[PDB]
Write a protein that binds this ligand. Structure first.
Ligand SMILES: *[C@@H]1O[C@H](CO)[C@@H](O[C@@H]2O[C@H](CO)[C@@H](O[C@@H]3O[C@H](CO[C@H]4O[C@H](CO)[C@@H](O)[C@H](O)[C@@H]4O)[C@@H](O)[C@H](O[C@H]4O[C@H](CO)[C@@H](O)[C@H](O)[C@@H]4O)[C@@H]3O)[C@H](O)[C@H]2NC(C)=O)[C@H](O)[C@H]1NC(C)=O
Ligand SMILES: Cc1nccn1Cc1cc(-c2ccc(F)c(C(F)F)c2)cnn1
Ligand SMILES: *[C@@H]1O[C@H](CO)[C@@H](O)[C@H](O)[C@H]1NC(C)=O
Ligand SMILES: *[C@@H]1O[C@H](CO)[C@@H](O)[C@H](O)[C@H]1NC(C)=O
Ligand SMILES: *[C@@H]1O[C@H](CO)[C@@H](O)[C@H](O)[C@H]1NC(C)=O
Ligand code: NA
Ligand code: NA
Ligand code: NA
Ligand code: NA
Lengths: 356, 357
């Protein structure tokens, strides 16, 4: 069978041996594990572009050890510019990237903005936490976060009360104490925060000054704010609740296996139906000339892959369709603790009475 | 020996690079530069977006630029905005009029010396107050641009009212269903927002439905009286042209004046850090980026070549000047100016579709 080149890019300390641990499809994968030390735009662009010139790269599987959401953005850009599938399977590469390019072939192992907002409301209905406020930054997806909450709350016969919706500008200096003034408006026992991990550290520092992080105030945050659970910023408040992707049972060697399976199956299926697959781009520096000879045709296949009887499919926004989410709580020892599971649109909490 | 502060630029040609180099030199001459002295660093646009993103790193961020000026090429400012925005290095759009660059959420540190096409609603509104068009029909393309114009006009209206808004799919050639809706209505003042190719399709359909004659008024922007849109445009149409909108030399001159003043105002403050030297290994934002953005957003340069320079909440140019154009016997005639805040009608008489309403 024909051979497709797949680059597995690993940023940070990882067991390549454990990762290196079957496909009887129309095409076969030629996997090359690649190390990368830096995560700036130049480094990522250069690494991928160099790999594409050397081998015939059909798709990329990317994993990183960082809390850098901008990695998803750099990858989306590369993917759309070179019409090459890139899968963000771990780290900042899997952090929500709202409004991916029209020409994007970038897919992420992680929950969408909408699913997380939905999970958040399920946690609230469980403990009868109906009175709340929303705080977001301009981090892309904020509009999607607020709208999902709003639409849900509107079409529900439950006594939901959305007190305030704050929008904070992080792009300017806070020499005027605007954020502080805005945060002072907050009176709700529950606060839904949608922003980045680096933005949350600032928000929380100010929220504390205004006495909004203690007992009586519960902050619920998305996956990206918690980021890497081993990096707990000092300013994060004790009792912080977050949604997390299963880092416990869905390990890195499994994700790499699944990444390879998606690219290989999608290629096999396209070849089986059209008697061709896309020719891997020889260069990044001819994208302008060559674009009438290229398309994102493989997306119709990458979005719908099934392997070992597992529905590996993706949403129209390039996020995993059916993830197992974990509900985490930042304890008194400043360590993240598992307090719930989000399975088959069903939430299963550890506690009936939420503890202090 | 002063501290050298680099200013970057992505310009169209080597002539324009020499204009930037000269504008920075004159800045150094006109200001007190014993403490801080500017240095011009520039490149021309690269053939593709990846090459451009790379060039921003390799040629500009490598030189520790405090800001990057960007002209629309002879391909967009997006890869420059994205790469510099990663570090929170402010970007100054000199000629880009697309509304999408006003979105703070995706263009993280971006200002422009030209307003977006949606700000043409400010002129239309003033035109409506002046000619007492209390009932209008707004036809917009169902794209970011079309919707940005609608959002902008609706804000000003909320006296004169928009009886109905009609959106169409970009690229649609048979618009007679949309225009038949508009014909049924009492209002005979039509405001259009569409690209050259889409404006052409509206004009062709409207002429077929005999809607480009007496009793009708067409109020349009710049894109709709440009290129092919002009070939099929009804006579009597009123459109706009942003004065100096396309003069990259004038915008280099004014952006450098604004940036130079902002740099000197910034160094009046304490704990000013340098931007990162190069991209490789640098993944944190420039800590002085947000303060420098605030200093820029609030800069006022009254004696600019393109006028009074100030920026709005989105860092878009305020007090922009427009030529009020009128298509008379298939010639574009200037009938007035929107000076930044007021309409000034010249001695050339408006000919409405037909004669005089
Ligand atoms: C775009 O076009 C507009 C419209 O003309 C310009 O705005 C006007 O600019 C002139 C000149 O700068 C201003 O004139 C000054 O008006 C003062 C009184 O203004 C009041 O009354 C007027 C008329 O009713 C109102 O429009 C206005 O809101 C005020 O309530 C006078 O006191 C001034 O006189 C003094 O200064 C002049 C020199 O400037 C001397 O000659 C006099 O001797 C005297 O000392 C003066 O006449 C006018 O106020 C502005 N109008 C508005 C609406 O703001 C814009 O400047 C122009 N923009 C650009 C970029 O060109
Ligand atoms: C967050 C989001 N949702 C929808 C759009 N965006 C913005 C965005 C940023 C970049 C990006 C960011 C940094 C960087 F350095 C580069 C360089 F690689 F081109 C690109 C690429 N694609 N989209
Ligand atoms: C990354 O760091 C290790 C440190 O020993 C080095 O061996 C490796 O070559 C570095 N990677 C690159 C791309 O230079
Ligand atoms: C997904 O894949 C299956 C094959 O397992 C195929 O039969 C089906 O048509 C695909 N679904 C969609 C929605 O395209
Ligand atoms: C462009 O601007 C410069 C001044 O900045 C001027 O010399 C030149 O005449 C202007 N061009 C046009 C076409 O008016
Ligand atoms: Na193409
Ligand atoms: Na001097
Ligand atoms: Na802006
Ligand atoms: Na006139």
């Amino acid at each position: 069978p024909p051979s497709i080149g797949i680059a597995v890019i690993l940023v940070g300390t990882s067991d390549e041996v454990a990762i290196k641990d079957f496909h009887h499809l129309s095409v076969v994968p030629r996997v090359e594990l690649v190390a990368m030390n830096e995560t700036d735009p130049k480094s990522i662009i250069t690494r991928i572009c160099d790999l594409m010139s050397d081998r015939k790269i059909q798709g990329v599987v990317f994993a990183d050890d960082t809390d850098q959401e901008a990695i998803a953005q750099i990858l989306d850009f590369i993917s759309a510019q070179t019409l090459t599938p890139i899968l963000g399977i771990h780290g900042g590469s899997s952090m929500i990237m709202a409004d991916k390019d029209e020409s994007s072939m970038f897919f992420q192992f992680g929950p969408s903005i909408e699913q997380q907002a939905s999970v958040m409301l399920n946690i609230m209905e469980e403990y009868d936490w109906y009175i709340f406020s929303i705080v977001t930054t301009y981090f892309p997806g904020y509009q999607d976060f607020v709208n999902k909450i709003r639409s849900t709350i509107e079409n529900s016969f439950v006594g939901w009360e959305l007190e305030e919706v704050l929008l904070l500008d992080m792009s300017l200096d806070d020499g005027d104490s605007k954020i502080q003034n805005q945060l002072k408006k907050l009176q709700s026992p529950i606060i839904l925060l949608y922003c980045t991990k680096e933005e949350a550290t600032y928000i929380f520092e100010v929220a504390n000054s205004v006495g909004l992080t203690g007992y009586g105030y519960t902050w619920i945050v998305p996956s990206l704010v918690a980021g890497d659970t081993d990096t707990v910023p000092a300013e994060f408040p004790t009792g912080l609740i977050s949604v997390s992707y299963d880092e416990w049972d869905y390990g890195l060697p499994a994700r790499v296996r699944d990444g390879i399976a998606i690219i290989t199956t999608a290629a096999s299926d396209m070849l089986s139906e059209h008697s061709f697959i896309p020719e891997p781009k020889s260069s990044c520096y001819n994208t302008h000339e060559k674009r009438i000879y290229q398309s994102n045709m493989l997306n119709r296949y990458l979005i719908n892959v099934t392997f070992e009887g597992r529905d590996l499919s993706f949403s129209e926004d390039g996020y995993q369709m059916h993830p197992k989410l974990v509900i985490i709580l930042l304890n008194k020892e400043r360590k993240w603790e598992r307090v719930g599971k989000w399975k088959d649109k069903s939430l299963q909490m550890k506690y009936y009475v939420w503890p202090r | 020996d002063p501290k050298i502060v680099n200013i970057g630029a992505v310009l169209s040609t080597k002539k324009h690079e020499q204009i930037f180099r000269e504008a920075v030199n004159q800045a150094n001459k006109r200001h007190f530069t014993r403490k801080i002295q500017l240095q011009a660093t520039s490149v021309t646009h690269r053939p593709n977006a990846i090459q451009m993103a790379l060039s921003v790193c390799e040629d500009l961020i490598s030189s520790q630029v405090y800001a990057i000026l960007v002209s629309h090429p002879p391909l967009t400012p997006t890869p420059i905005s994205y790469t510099a925005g990663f570090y929170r290095i402010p970007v100054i759009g000199l000629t880009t009029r697309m509304s999408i660059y006003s979105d703070k959420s995706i263009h993280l540190s971006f200002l422009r010396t030209v307003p977006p096409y949606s700000h043409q609603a400010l002129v239309w509104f003033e035109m409506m107050r002046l000619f007492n068009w209390n009932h209008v029909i707004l036809i917009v393309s169902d794209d970011h641009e079309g919707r940005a114009a609608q959002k902008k006009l609706e804000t000003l209206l909320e006296g004169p009212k928009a009886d109905k808004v009609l959106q169409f799919e970009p690229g649609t050639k048979n618009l007679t269903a949309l225009l038949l809706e508009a014909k049924e209505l009492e209002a005979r003042v039509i405001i259009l927002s569409a690209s050259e190719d889409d404006a052409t399709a509206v004009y062709k359909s409207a002429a077929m439905l005999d809607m480009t004659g007496a009793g009708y008024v067409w109020l349009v922007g710049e894109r709709e009286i440009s290129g092919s849109a002009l070939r099929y445009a009804p006579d009597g149409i009123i459109g706009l042209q942003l004065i100096n909108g396309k003069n990259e030399s004038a915008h280099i001159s004014d952006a450098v004046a604004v940036v130079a003043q902002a740099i000197h105002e910034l160094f009046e403050m304490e704990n000013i850090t340098d931007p990162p030297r190069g991209c490789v290994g640098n993944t944190n934002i420039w800590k002085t980026g947000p303060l420098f953005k605030r200093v820029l957003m609030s800069s006022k340069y009254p004696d600019g070549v393109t006028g009074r320079i100030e920026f709005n909440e989105d860092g878009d140019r305020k007090f922009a000047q427009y030529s009020i154009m009128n298509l008379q016997n298939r010639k574009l005639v200037q009938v007035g100016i929107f000076n930044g805040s007021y309409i000034i009608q010249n001695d050339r008489k408006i000919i409405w579709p037909g004669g005089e309403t």
